[PDB]
Amino acid sequence: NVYKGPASIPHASAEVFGAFFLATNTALLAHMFPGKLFGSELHVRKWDPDYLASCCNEQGMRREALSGKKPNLWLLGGGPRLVNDSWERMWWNNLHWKRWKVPRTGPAFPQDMYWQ
């Protein structure tokens, strides 16, 4: 009965907001207690990127070696830079990728539960 604005401008329902609220609260609760979600936990990813890269490099090097050629290693982040000052600058991309190992994998919140 009330105006509720023009119909041309899109409107968002209340069900979407309720779903968002419940989803945020449930995500926080599931993250707090790893072992209570029906006996299981919640995982952000399926396989770690480093694991996939290592498996792919292993398979590629095996295939190249069996074919009669010197195998090559593909680096995550990029190749080297042709410089003559320092070793860190030459391999900056791969070092930059590798230096984020702990933040990329591990969760920021505490893994276990305290006070309960």
Binding site: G18, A23, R45, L52, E58, Q59, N72, G79
Partner: protein, 431 residues
């Protein structure tokens, strides 16, 4: 990246001391011309297809004992030494290669079971499509997720690094793409568009799951979807071989078995969702207990699916901090020197204000106690108002001195140290 370009500019400015010194780092002319150069070179590289000449692979060469750590090499009993070098994997071949090919085919067929377990977002979307939009939509969604999984698994197993490595390098783009896809799907499902399915709608359904299979999605029940009926840690690891044709045959047989098992399971599910009833969940609920109606049941089911997909969409936000999601693509390393750089030798304030919230010790000075600020009350640290008396450290990083762990995080010490939050005050709102 930004930081690399800034470092290059700083190096160029340092080089020019000998020839033509600059007044300081932030001269308008030098910054302007370097910005123009950077933009022009970036666009030239983007347009000229010169990025195909990038280098991603290097050869690995084993150094001889002369150039190795000779101090580590030691001779034991005068007959052996510690320089270990075994000829990779050597295994005696089976009696007949056909037998091992058949074994690998059966193993792939068995391993294909774990790919179709309903524990991820794609399975949830397929289930919702099966429930709501009939059989064709669910079949198309299942086919799309199957195609995506098969493509990813074949790329990983066959060693196609040219696609795997660069795609895995784009750390944040893959998260943003998944977020965009999930947001679009959530809006489309919320608006509840219903009509007879055409070819274009079916291809959209296929493509949604195909693209979603290439991102990192929230998974429930781990350690079970990663199992494999073999002496490995997952289903993506290969098997030892002796030559190139045997490698190709064994891995092709494994992939073919996985594909056959997945396709058979998809066909079985397609027939099963039609056999008892198109929506047998209503009959199951009626048998279990009283049923309200059909429209209310559909409303409840739709709300449940929307809530589940919203949870799958936003489950990944608390996992990562802003240092890994914002500063990492810019070009910064963790605990970078830029964060702690001071404004000047006389001003202790940090240069970059937008990143002053990162890596703060509990003993750092409070910036809300400056004269004439009248900021928030902060009654929880009234006794320690000079410092940021709370611990929010992550990972291994953490320091403590004269502000112990027990005072910050443990028991009654933390509770007693914030006793001013529960002090009654006298206030009159009107009089």
């Amino acid at each position: 990246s930004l930081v690399t370009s800034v470092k290059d500019y700083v190096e160029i400015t340092h080089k020019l001391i000998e020839i033509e010194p600059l007044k300081n780092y932030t001269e308008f002319g030098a910054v302007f011309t370097y910005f123009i150069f950077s933009i022009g070179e970036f666009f030239k590289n983007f347009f000229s297809f010169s990025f195909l000449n990038n280098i991603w692979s290097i050869p690995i060469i084993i150094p001889d004992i002369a150039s190795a750590m000779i101090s580590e090499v030691s001779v034991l009993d005068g007959y052996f030494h510690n320089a270990f070098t075994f000829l990779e994997t050597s295994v005696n071949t089976t009696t007949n290669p056909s037998l091992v090919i058949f074994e690998k085919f059966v193993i792939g067929i068995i391993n294909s079971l774990f790919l179709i377990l309903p524990t991820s977002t794609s399975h949830l979307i397929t289930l919702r499509r099966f429930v709501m939009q009939g059989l064709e939509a669910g079949y198309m969604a299942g086919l799309g997720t199957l195609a995506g999984n098969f493509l990813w698994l074949a790329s990983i197993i066959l060693g196609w690094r040219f696609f795997v490595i660069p795609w895995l390098s784009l750390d944040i783009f893959r998260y943003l793409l998944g977020f965009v896809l999930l947001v679009k799907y959530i809006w489309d499902s919320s608006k509840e568009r219903r009509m007879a399915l055409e070819d274009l709608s079916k291809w959209k359904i296929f493509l949604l799951n195909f693209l979603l299979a290439l991102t990192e999605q929230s998974c429930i029940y781990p350690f079970i979807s990663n199992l494999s009926f073999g002496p490995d840690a997952s289903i993506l690891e290969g098997f030892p071989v002796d030559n190139y044709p045997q490698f190709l045959l064994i891995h092709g047989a494994y992939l073919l078995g996985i594909l056959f098992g997945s396709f058979s399971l998809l066909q079985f599910t397609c027939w099963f969702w039609e056999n008892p009833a198109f929506s047998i969940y209503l009959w199951i609920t009626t048998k279990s207990s009283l049923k309200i109606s059909t429209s209310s049941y559909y409303k409840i089911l739709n709300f449940t699916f929307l809530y589940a997909t919203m949870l799958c969409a936003i489950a990944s936000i608390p996992y990562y901090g802003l240092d890994y999601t914002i500063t990492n693509p810019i070009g910064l390393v963790p605990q970078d020197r830029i964060l702690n750089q001071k404004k000047s030798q006389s001003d202790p304030d940090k240069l970059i204000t937008e990143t002053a919230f990162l890596n703060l010790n509990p003993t750092d000075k409070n910036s809300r106690i400056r004269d004439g600020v009248h900021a928030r009350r902060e009654r929880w640290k009234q006794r320690l108002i000079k410092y940021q008396a709370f611990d929010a450290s992550t990972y291994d990083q953490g320091v403590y001195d004269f502000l112990t762990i027990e005072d910050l995080n443990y028991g009654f010490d933390r509770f007693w140290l914030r006793r001013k939050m529960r002090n009654h005050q006298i206030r009159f709102r009107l009089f």
